[PDB]
Design an enzyme around this catalytic site. Structure first.
Site, PDB file in Angstrom:
ATOM      1  CG  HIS A  13      -1.614  -1.263   1.378  1.00  0.00           C
ATOM      2  ND1 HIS A  13      -2.932  -1.337   1.227  1.00  0.00           N
ATOM      3  CD2 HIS A  13      -1.508  -2.489   1.537  1.00  0.00           C
ATOM      4  CE1 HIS A  13      -3.579  -2.439   1.600  1.00  0.00           C
ATOM      5  NE2 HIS A  13      -2.631  -3.303   1.670  1.00  0.00           N
ATOM      6  CG  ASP A  15      -2.657   4.209   1.899  1.00  0.00           C
ATOM      7  OD1 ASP A  15      -3.234   2.894   1.392  1.00  0.00           O
ATOM      8  OD2 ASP A  15      -3.082   5.127   1.331  1.00  0.00           O
ATOM      9  CD  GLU A 213      -5.201  -8.179   6.645  1.00  0.00           C
ATOM     10  OE1 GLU A 213      -6.422  -7.938   6.385  1.00  0.00           O
ATOM     11  OE2 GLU A 213      -4.448  -7.736   6.742  1.00  0.00           O
ATOM     12  CG  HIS A 234      -3.030 -10.174   3.850  1.00  0.00           C
ATOM     13  ND1 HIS A 234      -3.637  -9.098   3.699  1.00  0.00           N
ATOM     14  CD2 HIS A 234      -1.962  -9.700   4.338  1.00  0.00           C
ATOM     15  CE1 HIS A 234      -3.160  -7.978   3.892  1.00  0.00           C
ATOM     16  NE2 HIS A 234      -1.726  -8.490   4.036  1.00  0.00           N
ATOM     17  CG  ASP A 291      -0.057  -5.582   4.000  1.00  0.00           C
ATOM     18  OD1 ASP A 291      -0.438  -5.272   2.960  1.00  0.00           O
ATOM     19  OD2 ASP A 291      -0.350  -5.718   5.209  1.00  0.00           O
ATOM     20  CG  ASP A 292       0.735  -1.273   5.046  1.00  0.00           C
ATOM     21  OD1 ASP A 292       0.561  -1.410   3.556  1.00  0.00           O
ATOM     22  OD2 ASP A 292      -0.249  -1.361   5.661  1.00  0.00           O
TER      23      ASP A 292
HETATM   24 ZN    ZN Z   1      -2.648  -5.310   2.546  1.00  0.00          ZN
END
Ligand code: ZN
Length: 349
Positions: A13, A15, A213, A234, A291-292
């Site tokens: 992401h 973000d 997830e 996920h 992911d992040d």
């Molecule tokens: Zn994600």
């Protein structure tokens, strides 16, 4: 470096891939109360060290998103800086996802991060992120594509999102996602979400869904059969339903694994056999992702060495999963072939 060859990333992401020193600059120049004035200390409130819960990980965004959302220069720069980041870590193709509503401040209900009404519309955010990805690819030589996020709590947004996926299909947008709080019961069958994946099927928009997830296997099962997604973000708890698992194995469904993310979010309790091991053992279709990284204090080598010393992954297996990521990409047939020839040329095949 666990795997020093070109890699592919499909689930990360925008973000959660901001530089803590870019947040700091815009938090200051907009005069915003950030929980820290120091880069390394900002990363101490926002970064996660131990396993927590899904609502708590999503809460970390409330700390810094007010500094980014609603400001143009901040939106495009983090896109440019994101692809920069990915280049330094050996990524040749990356699909980066984000919710255009959560970066906007006008023509959005609700105005996120308690912003004031402004002039940045979700349709404008996609044109600015795409610009950063377009300039980054040209500066760093890595193919970068947006995916537009639906939020599970705001089904009213998802009508606009697909629709945006369709206007910018010839830009950087390749698919639509459904992210957010999977713990909210029945958010997968909210009517707003379903038209979106339905209109995506008609107009040929690719579909991925965060499912399995932190929920049961019923979460995955509507994502597959109702929203008819083509990839699972996920897909961990699919393994509690062996009938469904082996069906998607037979249908070559792609799983977007995020090992280090799966540990810090509580998705994978460390006493359990991680899902990715048998998905390696069954030679399923999966990829490795961050992911992040800002919120997990990670890079993609963190996720690769988690596999390597702890789950018995090999260079051989690293080659196969990245080629599977390349033919489960959302690129067109001509570019996805050109990407396969890049990985073929670098892998010795
Ligand atoms: Zn994600």
């Amino acid at each position: 470096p666990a795997f020093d060859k070109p890699k592919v990333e499909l689930h990360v992401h925008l973000d959660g891939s901001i530089k803590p020193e870019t947040i700091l600059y815009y938090g200051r120049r907009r005069g915003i109360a950030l929980p820290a004035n120091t880069a390394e200390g900002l990363l101490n409130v926002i970064g996660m060290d131990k396993p927590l819960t899904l609502p708590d990980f999503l809460a970390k965004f409330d700390y810094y998103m007010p500094a980014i959302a609603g400001c143009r220069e901040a939106i495009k720069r983090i896109a440019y800086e994101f692809v920069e980041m990915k280049a330094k870590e050996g990524v040749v193709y990356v699909e980066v996802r984000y919710s255009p509503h959560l970066l906007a401040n006008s023509k959005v209900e609700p105005i996120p991060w308690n912003q004031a009404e402004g002039d940045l519309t979700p349709d404008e955010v996609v044109a600015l992120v795409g610009q950063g990805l377009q300039e980054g690819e040209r500066d760093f030589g890595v193919k970068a594509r947006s995916i537009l996020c639906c939020m599970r709590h705001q089904p009213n947004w998802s009508p606009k999102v697909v629709e945006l996926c369709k206007k910018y299909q010839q830009q950087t947008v390749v698919a639509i996602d459904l992210a957010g709080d999977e713990t909210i019961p029945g958010s997968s069958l909210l009517p707003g979400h379903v038209q979106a994946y339905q209109e995506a099927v008609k107009s040929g928009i690719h579909r991925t869904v965060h499912a399995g997830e932190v929920g049961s296997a019923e979460v995955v099962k509507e994502a597959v059969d109702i929203l008819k997604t083509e990839r699972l973000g996920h897909g961990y708890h699919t393994l509690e339903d062996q009938a469904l698992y082996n069906r998607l194995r037979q249908e070559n469904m792609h799983f977007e694994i995020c090992p280090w993310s799966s540990y810090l979010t509580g998705a994978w309790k460390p006493d359990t056999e991680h899902a990715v091991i048998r998905l390696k053992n069954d030679q399923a279709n999966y990829s490795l992702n961050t992911d992040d990284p800002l919120i997990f204090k990670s890079t993609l080598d963190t996720d690769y060495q988690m596999t390597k010393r702890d789950m018995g992954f090999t260079e051989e297996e690293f080659k196969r999963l990245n080629i599977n990521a390349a033919k489960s990409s959302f690129l067109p047939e001509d570019e996805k072939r050109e990407l396969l020839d890049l990985l073929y040329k670098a892998y010795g095949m």
